[PDB]
Write a protein that binds this DNA or RNA. Structure first.
Lengths: 51, 103, 50
RNA sequence: CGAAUUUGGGUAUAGGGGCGAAAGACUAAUCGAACCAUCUAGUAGCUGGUUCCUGCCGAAGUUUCCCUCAGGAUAGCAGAA
RNA sequence: AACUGGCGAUGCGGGAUGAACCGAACGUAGAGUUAAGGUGCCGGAAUACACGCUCAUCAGACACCACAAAAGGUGUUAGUU
RNA sequence: UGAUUUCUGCCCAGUGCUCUGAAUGUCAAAGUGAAGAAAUUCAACCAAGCGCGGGUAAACGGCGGGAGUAACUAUGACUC
RNA sequence: UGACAUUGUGAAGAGACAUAGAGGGCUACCUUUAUAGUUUCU
RNA sequence: AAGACAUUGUCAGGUGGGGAGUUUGGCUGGGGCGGCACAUCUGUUAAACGAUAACGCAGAUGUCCUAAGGGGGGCUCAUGGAGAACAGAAAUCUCCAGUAGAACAAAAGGGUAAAAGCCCCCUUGAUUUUGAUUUUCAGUGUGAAUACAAACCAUGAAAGUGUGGCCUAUCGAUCCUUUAGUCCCUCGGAAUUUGAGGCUAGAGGUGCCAGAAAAGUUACCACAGGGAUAACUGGCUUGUGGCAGUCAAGCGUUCAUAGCGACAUUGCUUUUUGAUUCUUCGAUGUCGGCUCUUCCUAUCAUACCGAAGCAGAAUUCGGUAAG
RNA sequence: CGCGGGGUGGAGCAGCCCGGUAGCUCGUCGGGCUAGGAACCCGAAGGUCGUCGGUUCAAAUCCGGCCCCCGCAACCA
RNA sequence: CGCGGGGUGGAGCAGCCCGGUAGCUCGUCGGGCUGUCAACCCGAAGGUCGUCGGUUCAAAUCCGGCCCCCGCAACCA
RNA sequence: GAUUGACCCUU
């Protein structure tokens, strides 16, 4: 037979994600010292659409 | 077919060399031992890659095997082998045929 | 709707899967097309119930 | 015929691989497995061809065995010594 | 599928023509005689000789072979009481 | 599978998928115990799988034939 | 999936090898004691 | 966080059309399906030596038997008749006939009467060694069988007979395994010994039966070929189809033949369809229709006639006739 | 006009591989309560087997003088 | 490929791990309650446990040659 | 709180 589509999806040639429009990885603040002994106050500058 | 368990028959025992009494058994094939040169060669050939390297028979046609009686002389304990024709049923136990009977 | 070269389901004179579409977890790549390691199939009468 | 639209350029995916809104489609006029060179003067019980003269002798399509039936071995038939 | 003879593998004379039929098998020539087949002309060779039969408004004409039957006819010819 | 609408019946015996282990079952290499002088020959068993057992058809798929029943010929709601 | 190696340090229960004491008229698979060659997992 | 567990290395057992490599009989009135004519046996075909074909005809084989083998002895079978008491056409049946009309494991054909059949007694020659021979035949094998030799046995009073089955079928190489025999040869630096390898005879099997280890599909297809071979035409044949005769039992109120015509029987080009496989598979473009020409006559109409169960009209049966 | 099934009693007709002359089919003097009535047997059959024969086991079917289709010619490439 | 509890009725079942030989429905044979009508409850056909040997208190139960059932798709002359 | 279902003819 032939290599089937779900097999082909793993070589990641045309099946990689389209990451151009994205705004970055959405990750928490790193767990440094304040997040586990006190708190730290940040400000929500903007709320945006991530493609 | 019914064969008696005893038989007067020639024994070439070098001590009898004449007709003597023999006990009669059926011959059993005997276990195919390892370390026989043929099995050793077969195992060596089958080791590795290449699959089955010799032929395995499939087209069986015979429905009976030839029976071999083993005749153990009761005098000198010399053994002899003799085959009969092909039979579906073979009995060594003697239950003689009786003519003047009903059923 | 493919040919048998393209998929386990392809081919036939009618569009049918042919063999059971529930595939073993121990299957291989190229075999794992369908319902992988399905405990049950068909329409289920129930809710998630967490 | 305003969009699952059309298209340039750049870029990625390479052969039992790719790619496929799926026709075994497309992958440089090549696709039910591309092209190039080599292994390779691949094998062919099958088709075709097989180059001067004269003289003498001169068949067989039958037997047996063969995964044997378009083939061979064997015996027969023929030549030469 | 039969004791065989041929064609294949073979020309020659005859069957108009024809692998196999008939005659006969083959060096190059010359005389004679023939085979099978023929002798009105084509065409070499008697429009010979002899006795009959036949006239068809689809005659017939020489084996293999290239076809005709049952049944009929005071057509005509020859044959018992 | 193929928009709406309306519905999606029965069958887990078969094949497949899945799930505890209740298991006189089968059960490799290694490991162990008898013997042998030793190469070796004999015995259980915590492996997985296969069995067994349960589930599952919007999994693959399947959805017959008989016997009896009533007064036009039939005729079967009903019972096996 | 198992075994061996990587691979090193401590903890309760299950099989034999009771030399012996709980049973039913020349006597059944049989629950259970010293555990100083032995056992893997919960 | 996790922890001697995962991981990793090696081996071992599962699973593994996801992938790989292969294979997927022969004969054959094309191939396929069927069958086995593939190894065999009987009768016939088979044409009075032998041999002899077809997917000819009627069948059979892959078994069965410690007796259904071997010897000896005694007896005679099937059937018919006259027969006893229940009791009868078919129990028990005493005689008389009885050439086998019975039986002999099975298919058929042969063979057999103081037996080769049926009873009874004994028995293991269905044993050992190796040769020779007949059939198929290459005068190879296999299978089967024949007559001896040298033994050892059985049976009988003995002569004799017996080397499986009354004869003609009932079966199997190499390699491997396994058993039996000498406990004989070898393990190559002398060997306790085990193990292994040899010598001779059997068994485990190839039924495609001189013996490969083997599933499909291709309407996506490929190559070498084949007119050795199918699907047109053409060719031979004409069963079948179509058409036409002969004879007349009857139908036609009477009346075989105006018109028909049974039971039989003789024929005609192939407009049917078969049967065959001669031509063509380095290709003869295929169904029908359209178009157009021509030909045949077994004449539907038209021309002219004969005949009717032809009064007239309308019909029906025939002739010359395809203009 | 297929070696295939039929003319299966007044309809309707199932076994069809041997007819003491029913190959199967509501009622009628009568079986227990007779209050008439409500399931089952016979002294009633238009098959004298579609009709002329006798190879005639009793035949008058398995031979013929009348029509078609319940898996009736799917064939042409 | 030394084959796995197993062969208990005309159609389905385990009782047995040291010895009491025997049953559940249908198709039946029979008996009645309710007054009578299927159901409703009570005894019987196929069981000599498929020739066989062992325990001389109990072999259908435990073993040893066999017969059309077979998934032990279990390193297969 | 079980299984008791049915019963063809006139004012």
């Amino acid at each position: 037979g032939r290599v089937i589509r779900n097999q082909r999806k793993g070589a990641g040639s045309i099946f990689t994600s389209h990451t151009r429009l994205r705004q970055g990885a959405a990750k928490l603040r790193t767990l440094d010292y304040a997040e586990r002994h006190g708190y730290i106050r940040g400000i929500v500058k903007q709320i945006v659409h991530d493609s | 077919v019914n064969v008696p368990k005893t038989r007067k028959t020639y024994c070439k025992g070098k001590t009898c060399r004449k007709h003597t009494q023999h006990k009669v058994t059926q011959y059993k094939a005997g276990k195919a031992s390892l370390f026989a040169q043929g099995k050793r060669r077969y195992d060596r050939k089958q080791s590795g890659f290449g699959g089955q390297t010799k032929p395995v028979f499939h087209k069986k046609a015979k429905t009976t095997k030839k029976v071999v009686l083993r005749l153990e002389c009761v005098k000198c304990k010399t053994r002899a082998q003799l085959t009969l024709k092909r039979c579906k049923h073979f009995e060594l136990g003697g239950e003689k045929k009786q003519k003047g009977q009903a059923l | 709707a493919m040919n048998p070269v393209d998929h386990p389901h392809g081919g036939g004179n009618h569009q049918h899967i042919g063999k059971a579409s529930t595939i073993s977890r121990g299957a291989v790549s190229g075999q794992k097309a369908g319902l992988i390691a399905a405990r049950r199939t068909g329409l289920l009468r129930g809710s998630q119930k967490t």
